[PDB]
Amino acid sequence: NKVRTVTEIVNSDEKIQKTYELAEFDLKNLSSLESYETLKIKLALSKYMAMLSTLEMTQPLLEIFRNKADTRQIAAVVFSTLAFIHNRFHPLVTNFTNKMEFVVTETNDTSIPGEPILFTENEGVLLCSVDRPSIVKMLSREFDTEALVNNCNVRIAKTFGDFSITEVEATQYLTLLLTVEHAYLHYYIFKNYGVFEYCKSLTDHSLFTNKLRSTMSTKTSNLLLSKFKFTIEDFDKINSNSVTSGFNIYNFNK
């Protein structure tokens, strides 16, 4: 549907006319609905769960990662998550990198503090590192499942008028999805800008904004971690140890 507007000035009978197409306003309104974005995120998570299900991966993720002996399931789960994220970024390639190897880490002695899934080149083939105890500690941590994070009127008006997926399981799925999303961002910088840039990014995540917004911000969908604005409680007080009398002329990351 189209809406027409007419402007008339008091010096003549001239009328200048413009046509507005309502679809743009409808799209903005739909993008402003909380239920719409919630449905988008939940549909992404549901597609992830369905993708795991068709790969027999019905067992809870914590149970999958708790099995030390069976490495094939862990490798398949991580590879499938990487492929799902890759398809989300590029909705044209259904198969991930056709050949890559997996190594599972069970020791702190060879563990990376903060990047549980890491990628490296052995001069012959891609290799992916999986820190199994880190993922186990992530998924096994007790979750806050009774607290409320900030409509009562619609509830009042209403009052006057089969796979068993618990909340813990869904939170575990989302946790693994976000972790593999971080790993995939690192891997994307790797594959597209070299090992040097990948190891530069491992120590400074601020290069993501420059090496993603050039291509991803205008071609792919929205990232899962962008659904909410995350901040550290009392960040300024803790950061007060490292304060600079700064002069920022290349503040490329607000």
Binding site: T38, N108, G114, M138, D162, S206
Partner: protein
């Protein structure tokens, strides 16, 4: 005479937070510390834990010597208290947390801290990257890979129906806090400086990514 049940519940919650085994963010007061210490003293099979946490009053008095059977028994006691894995590093986290809580002065507003003083080799992120780096390549991979993305409308509808009552914001909060706590515990255990500038810049990157 004291109420064993209330003191046990307060101890359970405070230890859950102070062991980084839970993301439940409940404002803890001095009363909870008093209750947890009193319960630890009174219960016979938590005497080892009570002495362990009481030694933290003076920074110069460090952990009591325990033979392997004693450490195993204390681990079982902690597991029973939490009814949940739990190992020595959890006990180290608890010791550091309670030491910092005890040595802290009485104050009107909750003090926000980060995990520190757990587990000689004070390193940074890059040396760990290199070092552990090879220790990785040293290991041979287990699996070789050399993809169905089904859009079954009814199946996705049922999945959405199951997921619909879940408060997405709570799930995101739980996942993000879990990742943050795991990263912080790995940093502290590895004796590597945790640069919260980088971790906050991750979120800043996401925020800057969205608006373009």
């Amino acid at each position: 005479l004291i109420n064993m049940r209330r003191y046990r519940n307060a101890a359970r919650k405070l230890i859950h937070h102070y062991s980084l085994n839970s993301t439940s963010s409940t404002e803890y007061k001095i009363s909870d510390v008093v209750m947890t210490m009193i319960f630890l003293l009174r219960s016979e099979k938590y005497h080892s834990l009570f002495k362990l946490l009481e030694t933290t009053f003076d920074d110069y008095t460090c952990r009591p010597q325990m033979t392997q059977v004693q450490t195993d028994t204390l681990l079982d006691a902690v597991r029973s208290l939490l009814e949940m894995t739990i190992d020595l590093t959890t006990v180290d986290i608890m010791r550091s947390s309670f030491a910092r809580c005890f040595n802290s002065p009485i104050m009107r507003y909750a003090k926000i801290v980060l995990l520190q003083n757990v587990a000689d080799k004070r390193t940074t992120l890059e040396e760990l990257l290199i070092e552990r780096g090879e220790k990785i390549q040293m290991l041979q991979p287990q699996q070789y890979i050399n993809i169905p993305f089904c859009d079954d409308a009814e199946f996705l509808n049922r999945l959405l129906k199951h997921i619909d009552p879940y408060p997405l914001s709570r799930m995101y909060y739980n996942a993000a806090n879990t990742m943050f706590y795991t990263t912080m515990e790995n940093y502290a255990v590895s004796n590597c400086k945790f640069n919260i500038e980088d971790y906050n810049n991750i979120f800043k990157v996401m925020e800057n990514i969205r608006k373009h």
